[PDB]
Design an enzyme around this catalytic site. Sequence first.
Site, mmCIF file in Angstrom:
data_model
loop_
_atom_site.group_PDB
_atom_site.id
_atom_site.type_symbol
_atom_site.label_atom_id
_atom_site.label_comp_id
_atom_site.label_asym_id
_atom_site.label_seq_id
_atom_site.Cartn_x
_atom_site.Cartn_y
_atom_site.Cartn_z
ATOM 1 N N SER A 23 1.920 -5.897 -17.076
ATOM 2 C CA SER A 23 1.800 -4.490 -17.457
ATOM 3 C C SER A 23 3.155 -3.795 -17.470
ATOM 4 O O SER A 23 3.506 -3.102 -18.436
ATOM 5 C CB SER A 23 0.872 -3.764 -16.486
ATOM 6 O OG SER A 23 1.488 -3.624 -15.220
ATOM 7 N N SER A 24 3.940 -3.987 -16.405
ATOM 8 C CA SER A 24 5.224 -3.312 -16.310
ATOM 9 C C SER A 24 6.234 -3.856 -17.309
ATOM 10 O O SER A 24 7.048 -3.083 -17.833
ATOM 11 C CB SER A 24 5.763 -3.412 -14.884
ATOM 12 O OG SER A 24 4.944 -2.668 -13.998
ATOM 13 N N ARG B 118 8.090 -6.523 13.406
ATOM 14 C CA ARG B 118 7.167 -6.074 12.374
ATOM 15 C C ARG B 118 5.888 -6.901 12.373
ATOM 16 O O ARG B 118 5.826 -8.000 12.930
ATOM 17 C CB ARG B 118 7.803 -6.146 10.985
ATOM 18 C CG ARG B 118 8.828 -5.077 10.695
ATOM 19 C CD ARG B 118 9.110 -4.969 9.198
ATOM 20 N NE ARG B 118 9.907 -6.053 8.651
ATOM 21 C CZ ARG B 118 10.266 -6.131 7.375
ATOM 22 N NH1 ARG B 118 9.885 -5.178 6.533
ATOM 23 N NH2 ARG B 118 10.998 -7.143 6.943
ATOM 24 N N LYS C 157 26.176 10.447 -6.820
ATOM 25 C CA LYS C 157 25.026 11.152 -7.389
ATOM 26 C C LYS C 157 24.543 12.276 -6.477
ATOM 27 O O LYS C 157 24.236 13.379 -6.949
ATOM 28 C CB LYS C 157 23.883 10.176 -7.656
ATOM 29 C CG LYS C 157 24.094 9.272 -8.853
ATOM 30 C CD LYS C 157 22.822 8.540 -9.216
ATOM 31 C CE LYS C 157 21.735 9.536 -9.537
ATOM 32 N NZ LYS C 157 21.053 9.198 -10.800
ATOM 33 N N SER D 172 17.057 15.259 -10.753
ATOM 34 C CA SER D 172 18.123 15.849 -11.560
ATOM 35 C C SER D 172 17.598 16.957 -12.460
ATOM 36 O O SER D 172 18.193 18.040 -12.531
ATOM 37 C CB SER D 172 18.794 14.771 -12.400
ATOM 38 O OG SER D 172 19.770 15.336 -13.255
ATOM 39 N N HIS E 150 15.007 -6.718 -4.600
ATOM 40 C CA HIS E 150 15.834 -5.505 -4.604
ATOM 41 C C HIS E 150 15.842 -4.737 -5.940
ATOM 42 O O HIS E 150 15.785 -3.485 -5.908
ATOM 43 C CB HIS E 150 17.273 -5.762 -4.153
ATOM 44 C CG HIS E 150 18.054 -4.498 -4.023
ATOM 45 N ND1 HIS E 150 17.792 -3.576 -3.035
ATOM 46 C CD2 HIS E 150 19.015 -3.953 -4.804
ATOM 47 C CE1 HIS E 150 18.591 -2.538 -3.185
ATOM 48 N NE2 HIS E 150 19.337 -2.734 -4.257
ATOM 49 N N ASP F 138 4.850 9.813 -31.192
ATOM 50 C CA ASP F 138 4.646 9.132 -29.918
ATOM 51 C C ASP F 138 5.239 7.736 -30.054
ATOM 52 O O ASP F 138 5.807 7.404 -31.099
ATOM 53 C CB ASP F 138 3.178 9.081 -29.476
ATOM 54 C CG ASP F 138 2.833 10.207 -28.505
ATOM 55 O OD1 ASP F 138 1.829 10.912 -28.731
ATOM 56 O OD2 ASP F 138 3.590 10.403 -27.528
ATOM 57 N N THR G 75 25.369 5.964 -5.518
ATOM 58 C CA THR G 75 24.319 6.835 -4.997
ATOM 59 C C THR G 75 24.928 8.019 -4.254
ATOM 60 O O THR G 75 24.434 9.154 -4.345
ATOM 61 C CB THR G 75 23.399 6.032 -4.079
ATOM 62 O OG1 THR G 75 22.882 4.904 -4.792
ATOM 63 C CG2 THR G 75 22.242 6.873 -3.615
ATOM 64 N N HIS H 20 20.593 -9.379 0.546
ATOM 65 C CA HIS H 20 20.799 -8.638 1.782
ATOM 66 C C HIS H 20 19.536 -8.584 2.628
ATOM 67 O O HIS H 20 19.581 -8.071 3.748
ATOM 68 C CB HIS H 20 21.341 -7.221 1.516
ATOM 69 C CG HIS H 20 20.500 -6.371 0.608
ATOM 70 N ND1 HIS H 20 20.961 -5.909 -0.606
ATOM 71 C CD2 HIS H 20 19.254 -5.864 0.751
ATOM 72 C CE1 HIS H 20 20.028 -5.169 -1.177
ATOM 73 N NE2 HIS H 20 18.982 -5.128 -0.376
ATOM 74 N N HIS H 21 18.423 -9.115 2.123
ATOM 75 C CA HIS H 21 17.216 -9.326 2.905
ATOM 76 C C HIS H 21 17.176 -10.704 3.551
ATOM 77 O O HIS H 21 16.170 -11.054 4.172
ATOM 78 C CB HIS H 21 15.970 -9.148 2.030
ATOM 79 C CG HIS H 21 16.058 -8.016 1.058
ATOM 80 N ND1 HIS H 21 15.543 -6.766 1.324
ATOM 81 C CD2 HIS H 21 16.576 -7.951 -0.190
ATOM 82 C CE1 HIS H 21 15.754 -5.976 0.288
ATOM 83 N NE2 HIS H 21 16.379 -6.671 -0.644
ATOM 84 N N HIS I 239 -2.082 -2.322 1.905
ATOM 85 C CA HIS I 239 -1.365 -1.047 1.894
ATOM 86 C C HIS I 239 -0.048 -1.164 1.148
ATOM 87 O O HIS I 239 0.206 -0.406 0.199
ATOM 88 C CB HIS I 239 -1.119 -0.577 3.327
ATOM 89 C CG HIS I 239 0.095 0.282 3.489
ATOM 90 N ND1 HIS I 239 0.164 1.571 3.010
ATOM 91 C CD2 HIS I 239 1.283 0.040 4.091
ATOM 92 C CE1 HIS I 239 1.345 2.085 3.305
ATOM 93 N NE2 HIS I 239 2.043 1.176 3.959
ATOM 94 N N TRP J 281 3.467 -8.110 1.873
ATOM 95 C CA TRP J 281 3.710 -8.009 0.432
ATOM 96 C C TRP J 281 4.764 -8.993 -0.052
ATOM 97 O O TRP J 281 4.809 -9.301 -1.245
ATOM 98 C CB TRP J 281 4.137 -6.594 0.059
ATOM 99 C CG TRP J 281 5.530 -6.288 0.478
ATOM 100 C CD1 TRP J 281 5.969 -6.085 1.749
ATOM 101 C CD2 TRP J 281 6.674 -6.163 -0.368
ATOM 102 N NE1 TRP J 281 7.317 -5.838 1.751
ATOM 103 C CE2 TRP J 281 7.775 -5.880 0.462
ATOM 104 C CE3 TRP J 281 6.878 -6.261 -1.746
ATOM 105 C CZ2 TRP J 281 9.059 -5.695 -0.040
ATOM 106 C CZ3 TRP J 281 8.154 -6.075 -2.243
ATOM 107 C CH2 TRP J 281 9.228 -5.797 -1.391
ATOM 108 N N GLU K 180 13.372 -4.370 -7.792
ATOM 109 C CA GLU K 180 12.090 -3.677 -7.829
ATOM 110 C C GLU K 180 12.184 -2.291 -7.206
ATOM 111 O O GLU K 180 11.663 -1.322 -7.768
ATOM 112 C CB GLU K 180 11.020 -4.508 -7.127
ATOM 113 C CG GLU K 180 9.785 -3.746 -6.655
ATOM 114 C CD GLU K 180 8.930 -3.190 -7.785
ATOM 115 O OE1 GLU K 180 9.038 -3.652 -8.935
ATOM 116 O OE2 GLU K 180 8.107 -2.297 -7.514
ATOM 117 N N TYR L 293 14.969 -0.588 -6.830
ATOM 118 C CA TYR L 293 15.860 0.252 -7.629
ATOM 119 C C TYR L 293 15.158 0.755 -8.890
ATOM 120 O O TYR L 293 15.383 1.899 -9.319
ATOM 121 C CB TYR L 293 17.150 -0.506 -7.921
ATOM 122 C CG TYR L 293 18.055 -0.461 -6.714
ATOM 123 C CD1 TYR L 293 18.532 0.754 -6.254
ATOM 124 C CD2 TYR L 293 18.380 -1.611 -5.998
ATOM 125 C CE1 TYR L 293 19.333 0.834 -5.147
ATOM 126 C CE2 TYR L 293 19.190 -1.548 -4.870
ATOM 127 C CZ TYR L 293 19.661 -0.307 -4.459
ATOM 128 O OH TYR L 293 20.461 -0.159 -3.356
#
Lengths: 104, 45, 51, 121, 534, 134
Positions: E157-158, E438, E319, E256, E241, E92, E316, E290-291, E62, E127, E243, E245
Amino acid sequence: AHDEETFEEFTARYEKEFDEAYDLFEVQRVLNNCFSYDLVPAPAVIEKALRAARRVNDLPTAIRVFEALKYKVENEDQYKAYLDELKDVRQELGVPLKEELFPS
Amino acid sequence: GRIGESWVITEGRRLIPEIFQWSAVLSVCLGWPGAVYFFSKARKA
Amino acid sequence: VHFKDGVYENIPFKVKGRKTPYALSHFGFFAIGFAVPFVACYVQLKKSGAF
Amino acid sequence: PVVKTAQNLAEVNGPETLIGPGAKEGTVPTDLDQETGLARLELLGKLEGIDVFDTKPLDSSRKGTMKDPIIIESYDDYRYVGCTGSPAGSHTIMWLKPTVNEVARCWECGSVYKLNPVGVP
Amino acid sequence: MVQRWLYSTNAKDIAVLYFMLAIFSGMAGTAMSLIIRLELAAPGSQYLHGNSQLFNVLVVGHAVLMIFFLVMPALIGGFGNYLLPLMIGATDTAFPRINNIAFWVLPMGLVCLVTSTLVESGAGTGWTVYPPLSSIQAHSGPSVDLAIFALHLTSISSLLGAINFIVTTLNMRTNGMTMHKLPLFVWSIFITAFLLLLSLPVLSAGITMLLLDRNFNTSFFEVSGGGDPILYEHLFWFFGHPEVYILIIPGFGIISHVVSTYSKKPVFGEISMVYAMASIGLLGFLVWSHHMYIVGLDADTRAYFTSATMIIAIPTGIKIFSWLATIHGGSIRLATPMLYAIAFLFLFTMGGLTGVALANASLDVAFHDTYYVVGHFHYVLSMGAIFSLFAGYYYWSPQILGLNYNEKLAQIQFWLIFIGANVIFFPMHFLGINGMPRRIPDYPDAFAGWNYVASIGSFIATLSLFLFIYILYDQLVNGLNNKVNNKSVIYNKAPDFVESNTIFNLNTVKSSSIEFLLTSPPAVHSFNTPAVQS
Amino acid sequence: VQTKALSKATLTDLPERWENMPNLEQKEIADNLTERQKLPWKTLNNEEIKAAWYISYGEWGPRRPVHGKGDVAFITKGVFLGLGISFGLFGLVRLLANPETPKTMNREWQLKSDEYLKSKNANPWGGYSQVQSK
Ligand code: HEA
Ligand code: HEA
Ligand SMILES: [Cu+2]
Ligand SMILES: [Mg+2]
Ligand SMILES: [Zn+2]
């Protein structure tokens, strides 16, 4: 100009912008750009807008001035003390309002 | 403004009915755990 | 060759001129998409216990 | 049949005239000798003086309305034009689509755009 | 037709295929979310009887499927591939075969991820696939190798899409696009494509170190032998992190644009907003641990990271304040992407406030690996990226697909997903602060109520997606009849007040980007000639 | 004095008539009204001023509202129907799960399990009673 616009520069700039329009798109465009600012315009602007809508010869943009203004103002005492200042221009130009035209 | 009903009154009339419905929509967007706890057997229902 | 453009020549599905209804393909796509974890659960539940 | 190789930009006649002569047995090839097609076209243009693929922000000096429009040029029947006021940055960028049979009016600036559609399809 | 869909080096016909794999994998991932939350509905061994390894396999499926095969395709790949050439006037994209191989190496990562969950019971790690939980002693089999080969392929790919995007908006802009005149979604795809090639190399290095200490006998994280598993936590969260963002910045761009065009107002200070977004991008690398407030860092470096994550929190905030400023004073036309844009602000501000509750390294000792964390990220990831995805689809697909949807079904779909997803993730906070950890199959039966409430909510959140599938069908077979027969909304930008209808039919679309001037479904060679701008 | 005024039957009841009029008659009375406006405005009769205002500024076509004619009622009916449908399908999916419960779920176990808690005064000021079963 990102510097602020005082009220006299506002009304002079827009009177010279209502004088120059010739088509219908121009009158409605400069009317929208005059009404979508922050202040409500003094009647020296809006009687010139009524003349500029008379020059193109179409009626309902000389009525939606009055309804957009009723949406603009903060109460109805300002609206009544406004509308008795544009009385005779509304008389000899012969435009109606909304509330007497569409009674509901 | 200068002439008319005063701006304090004519914006209080606009906003004072809005505060109660804001409190209603926030008390039912965050307060439904209270409503689901109220009917369960943990409150000796 | 510039491929010719229309309202239904931008997607891989053919929609208007078919033999079968479009609902068959359009819901079978998400049927196999929604049923790949169920077949993973079945192949994992026959390997260890029962089912 | 007979084909020469377009010594400058005046004598191009399609994609069969941009070939040019090959290098010799010992010299390194220059770009004037061997380059073909669109790159050869851009090189021949830049050696003549002009540059093809005319990229320039459009003229927003005058306003221009229906007595004399702002004339834009396109090799097709439409050209997307992003108007940004009577100075270069007056109001925010509004995109209009002037085509062959209709002028484009800005609705915030007020300027109009009309084509001289070159075409040759 | 084989050369138009299998070879197909044209950035319009690659984005449709990106979206097709996106809706396929999102259906598979939400089937897994339904199975997880259906098994966690009550204490005691439910539908999957015993078998906690199957639940671990389902939760890693998942998580990793819905992250790397729905949100990242349908935000980066699909939307960037269709819109980044179509907003800056390129005919293009540059390197067209590169973003064809990016799409075509996506679903083989998908099929090896699918077949990783079948062999030798399976990869269950979550994950964030950790050692020595995934080393060969405590986890034997070829399962997690295929599960991380999927991450190798999605990573490739990314990155190829990132290089593609960066060069195609650094060189092939139109005639008048300066370095700061682009629409804000182009800037979001720009900065996201920088964070990809600045971040995921470290990820692929760390996970191939995990692979060659699984199978090639090396000792990067095998601890009896020299290594340490803390190095994987560092090397993973240095990507982990950036990822998210990456996953949330095009959401900011989409939101926006839709609040700019549904309130008849430009965004309040676009230059300060893009400076805030770029500083969020260049600052999101400095807070990667921070994780890892629990694992045994010093109090000094924990003090540094809990200082720096609040300076992550401030732009943020400015924004969201600019979003409130640009919807203030407008003429808000409440259509169905504007509803998603309005809901995104509240449902992401809520998750960001509980995120800065998490960000204190003092306070993270009471909340780590606890359902409070699930309530935070299933706000800011789920509601954030997917309410922006829905406000991307319902706003752009009448222009892309050329078929108008049904409107009342779109609004019942929005209200169903809004109610039925607010009822899931809100009891997760109470489960977190009451003490639920968890990744448990299920739990000590004290907190037996909030799991049942979340499970009765997940069925609403699944039924709304079934109604979204019917919205796709009703759009695909009743597009022209929803144009004609008055079931849809046709003009997204309403005519202004003093403008006539005969004058609105002159200037139909008052856009500010190119995309709503191209005809429905646009031509395969749209910009034959360049699109000039001053 | 050149153009003729529109008669009463061509122009009566026009806000209640504009949607089902053919597209060949609409252009005709649009032309007729936009040339009638070129006169002095006081000689425009009060039947056609409403007609001009509804033609140029009415709630038709481009100015059609997005929530028109009781569709807010349709969408709240759809929302509550979807809640009921998902509730019923969750119930009949819940019906087939597993026959037996864990044995420490009924109230008889819970009274012993919190008597054991008050023996060792766990959670003394907050809640400690666990029953949650009928
Ligand atoms: C992409 C991110 C994402 C999203 C959206 C979700 C959404 C959901 N998740 Fe979660 N989840 C994670 C990523 C996500 N999750 C991660 C990373 C973990 C941690 C795993 C670990 O650490 O072990 C986790 C863990 C996790 C838990 C905690 C279990 C535990 O660790 O103990 C649960 C329990 O309920 C759960 C189930 C669900 C359900 C029912 C939804 C529902 O919201 C699903 C419904 C969603 C939709 C209906 C969205 C619409 C879907 C579409 C396909 C739209 C298509 C539109 C376009 C393409 C434009 N997942
Ligand atoms: C989409 C990616 C994404 C985003 C954008 C965020 C947003 C934030 N997150 Fe989250 N987070 C995750 C992804 C993300 N998170 C994931 C995947 C996990 C679980 C990982 C695991 O498996 O362990 C997690 C869990 C997580 C942890 C790990 C805790 C743990 O596991 O022990 C931390 C730690 O600091 C954290 C904090 C924050 C903060 C401060 C923000 C901020 O960026 C939020 C910014 C928004 C606001 C701040 C609100 C708006 C601002 C205002 C209204 C102005 C006023 C506000 C202030 C003055 C503060 N969240
Ligand atoms: Cu993080
Ligand atoms: Mg952990
Ligand atoms: Zn302009």
